[PDB]
Amino acid sequence: YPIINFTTAGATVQSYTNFIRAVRGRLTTGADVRHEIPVLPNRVGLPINQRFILVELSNHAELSVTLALDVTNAYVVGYRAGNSAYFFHPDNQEDAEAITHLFTDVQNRYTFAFGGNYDRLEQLAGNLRENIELGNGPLEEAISALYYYSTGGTQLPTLARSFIICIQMISEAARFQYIEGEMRTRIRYNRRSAPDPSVITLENSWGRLSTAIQESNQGAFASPIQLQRRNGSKFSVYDVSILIPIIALMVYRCAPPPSSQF
Numbered sequence: 127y128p129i130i131n132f133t134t135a136g137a138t139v140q141s142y143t144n145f146i147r148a149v150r151g152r153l154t155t156g157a158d159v160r161h162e163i164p165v166l167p168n169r170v171g172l173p174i175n176q177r178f179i180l181v182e183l184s185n186h187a188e189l190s191v192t193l194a195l196d197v198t199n200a201y202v203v204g205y206r207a208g209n210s211a212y213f214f215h216p217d218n219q220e221d222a223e224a225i226t227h228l229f230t231d232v233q234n235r236y237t238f239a240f241g242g243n244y245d246r247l248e249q250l251a252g253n254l255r256e257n258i259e260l261g262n263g264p265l266e267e268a269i270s271a272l273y274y275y276s277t278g279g280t281q282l283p284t285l286a287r288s289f290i291i292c293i294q295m296i297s298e299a300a301r302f303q304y305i306e307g308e309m310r311t312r313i314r315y316n317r318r319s320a321p322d323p324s325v326i327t328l329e330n331s332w333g334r335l336s337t338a339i340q341e342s343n344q345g346a347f348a349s350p351i352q353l354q355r356r357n358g359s360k361f362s363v364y365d366v367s368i369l370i371p372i373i374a375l376m377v378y379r380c381a382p383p384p385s386s387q388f
């Protein structure tokens with residue numbers, strides 16, 4: 127599987143931007159672009175050799191971990207640190223089979239009994255996303271925490287917190303230019319901060335936004351989607367147009383309707 131490298135060591139806006147762009151480039155082809163917004167490959171009939179990408183994360187502490195991302199949804203399905211690999215509890219038998227194709231040379235393979243969704247990870251972390259700081263420092267620390275899990279150095283709440291950091295700074299940033307921008311800001315000033323309601327509501331709405339765009343009538347939503355601004359106030363989305371600078375990738379929901387051209 128293709129590997130994309132990022133390091134927190136001396137990270138800049140440019141090096142992070144290069145990284146996120148490269149992740150997007152490995153997640154998607156140019157085959158499926160709707161209202162200027164790329165769609166991830168359809169799960170249905172996707173060959174196993176095209177199913178995953180690998181994100182090799184290094185830090186200033188000279189430690190490396192490799193995340194495995196599912197190309198169908200940019201989901202972090204598990205990770206490798208040295209001679210151990212850990213996978214989140216699969217949703218189904220097909221996904222369970224799929225992950226057997228990841229880190230095949232690794233000495234120790236584990237599947238967590240828990241799923242990798244935010245709700246579960248927040249429960250285990252003892253903190254919600256809104257109270258978990260993001261930025262280069264948190265990511266540096268997250269890489270170390272993932273690295274030391276197999277040897278007993280990392281408590282489960284810290285591991286869960288560290289997953290939450292990685293997921294948002296990689297997968298969510300890939301999904302949303304807006305979230306990429308929010309991480310760029312944190313990196314630029316080297317100041318960690320928890321995600322505000324604009325970030326949280328985008329994350330929570332990714333599936334619904336993807337479906338609404340794909341089901342839209344020439345871009346127009348049948349039902350508006352409510353997001354939140356930075357201050358927590360409501361922002362109503364009626365149309366794909368407003369989302370073009372915000373959403374970089376969509377999960378596949380359906381084949382697009384025939385070209386609507388007059």
Ligand SMILES: Nc1nc(=O)c2ncc(C(=O)NCC(=O)N[C@@H](Cc3ccccc3)C(=O)O)nc2[nH]1
Binds near residue numbers: 199200242243244298
């Ligand atoms: N491990 C992991 N990798 C991710 O990329 C990821 N990305 C997102 C979430 C998550 O709970 N999101 C909250 C949410 O409301 N998700 C929606 C939208 C969605 C997000 C990601 C993938 C598919 C759908 C849903 O589950 O329906 N969890 C993740 N866990």
